[PDB]
Every structure is written in structure tokens, then in C-alpha cells.
């Protein structure tokens, strides 16, 4: 459990976490946060770190 998102987006730099089952129900969570904020970019994981990355 527990995945964190990294937003390296235009004029919005930062990070957040989410309690989830599978990684994919992290993606759908963060990814939504991402459009709730107007971030739009490429994405990445990294099970080594259980992380996600948005790069506008």
C-alpha cells in the first residue's frame, strides 16, 4: 500500500500520497488529481520506489 505522485508540471511543482490496493488504483487516483489541477503530461512508475511521475 501507499503510492506517492511527483508533479513536475508547468507552474506546479510538488508531491502527494495515496492509500491504495494495487498500483493501478493509484494511477487512477493520482491521475485524477492531475486533471483536477490542470497538469497534463507523461507518466512513469518505479516499484523500487512505488512512485509516479507527471512531466508536463
Amino acid at each position: 500500500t501507499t503510492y506517492k505522485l511527483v508533479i513536475n508540471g508547468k507552474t506546479l511543482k510538488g508531491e502527494t500520497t495515496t492509500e491504495a490496493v494495487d498500483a493501478a488504483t493509484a494511477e487512477k487516483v493520482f491521475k485524477q488529481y492531475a486533471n483536477d489541477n490542470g497538469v497534463d503530461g507523461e507518466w512513469t512508475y518505479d516499484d523500487a520506489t512505488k512512485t509516479f511521475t507527471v512531466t508536463e
Partner: protein, 206 residues
């Protein structure tokens, strides 16, 4: 004998946390000539241990060798070319199948949601409908979820070609009439190459 190429499952390419795999399948393998060597080249260059994995499957009266190359979400999505090169002594020369992601300017899909019919309420379970029209290419995938959790009892009609060159699919999620009335928030997530963030999710509540 014969070779058969297969593209990744839409969802495996649109969700980062997943794995796009291109599947090469060899058939009519026979018994005295099963050494079917595998060559995969991504957009030209050869990708050796790209992952590249095989394994024997005996049946009929011929074998069926299968190799599978783990693709890169962005390449497939950028229309890269996947090459399966099969060779084996039972043949005169190398066979080569290529495969690519559909081509065309992508049309972002529109996602509307409609509640049950005033008339279907008379029953025990009602149907939540989720429209996704006007899109292309036809590769897409829908899912449903209520509060942070995924429902299951749902079905999704394959994409159909609409009269304006765009596509349209309907996806129907079911529920005991109670939850629908209790005031639950259902939510049809749509995943697509064309949307912002390869994702959207429109609600639906009483």
C-alpha cells in the same frame, strides 16, 4: 507452418503501471522441426533480450512456439513498428510480420452518463449507462467504480463506427435498486489515447 502477430491490450498501453506486450505466435509446428528462432526489431534496430520469452505447447499433432516482447507504452503510442522474425529449418526463408498502432488523427472521446429509465425502477436492479462517443482510434477501455472502489457487474459494448468517422461505445453497470436510491455516487472512468492524461472519469448520482 505460420506466424501470427498480436498488439498489446489497449488498457496495457494506456495505463503506465501496466505492461504492453506484443505477442508472436507460431503454428503448425510439427515434431521434427520445432527450432523456431526468434527475432524482434523495434522500429528497425534489433531488440535482443528486449525481454523476449518463449515456451513449447504440444497439441493437435503440431507444436506452437510463442514469444512475447514487452513493449514501451510511449513507442507503441507513437506508432513505432514491431517486428517478429521467425526462422526454422522446416522453411526456405525467414518470415516477417510487422504490426503497428492504428493510424489517423486521434479524436478525443466525449464521455456522458445517463441514469436508469424512470420505467426500469419498478424492478430489483437498475442499469447505469455510460456513453463514450466520437472517438478514434477505436482502441479504448472503460471501467466503473463507486466510492474509491470498483464495481464489477458491468458490460461494455465493443466500439462501433459512427457516421462521422468517429467511434462510439456504450458501457452498462448494474446495481440493486437500493444503492441507486440510497444516493450512491457511481463513476464511469474512461481511458483513452486522446484524453488529457490518458484518462477522465465522469460521475453519476441520484
Amino acid at each position: 507452418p505460420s506466424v501470427f502477430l498480436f498488439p498489446p491490450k489497449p488498457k496495457d498501453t494506456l495505463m503506465i503501471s501496466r505492461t504492453p506486450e506484443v505477442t508472436c505466435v507460431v503454428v503448425d509446428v510439427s515434431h521434427e522441426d520445432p527450432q523456431v528462432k526468434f527475432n524482434w526489431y523495434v522500429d528497425g534496430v534489433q531488440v535482443h533480450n528486449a525481454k523476449t520469452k518463449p515456451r513449447e505447447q504440444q497439441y493437435n499433432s503440431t507444436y506452437r512456439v510463442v514469444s512475447v516482447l514487452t513493449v514501451l507504452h510511449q513507442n507503441w503510442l507513437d506508432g513505432k513498428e514491431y517486428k517478429c522474425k521467425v526462422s526454422n529449418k522446416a522453411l526456405p526463408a525467414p518470415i516477417e510480420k510487422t504490426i503497428s498502432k492504428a493510424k489517423g488523427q486521434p479524436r478525443e472521446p466525449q464521455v456522458y452518463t445517463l441514469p436508469p429509465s424512470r420505467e426500469e425502477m419498478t424492478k430489483n436492479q437498475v442499469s447505469l449507462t455510460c456513453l463514450v462517443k466520437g472517438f478514434y482510434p477505436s482502441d479504448i477501455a472503460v471501467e466503473w467504480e463507486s466510492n474509491g472502489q470498483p464495481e464489477n457487474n458491468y458490460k461494455t459494448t465493443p466500439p462501433v463506427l459512427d457516421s462521422d468517422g468517429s467511434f462510439f461505445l456504450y458501457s452498462k453497470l448494474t446495481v440493486d435498486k437500493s444503492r441507486w436510491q440510497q444516493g450512491n455516487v457511481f463513476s464511469c472512468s474512461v481511458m483513452h489515447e486522446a484524453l488529457h492524461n490518458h484518462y477522465t472519469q465522469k460521475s453519476l448520482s441520484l
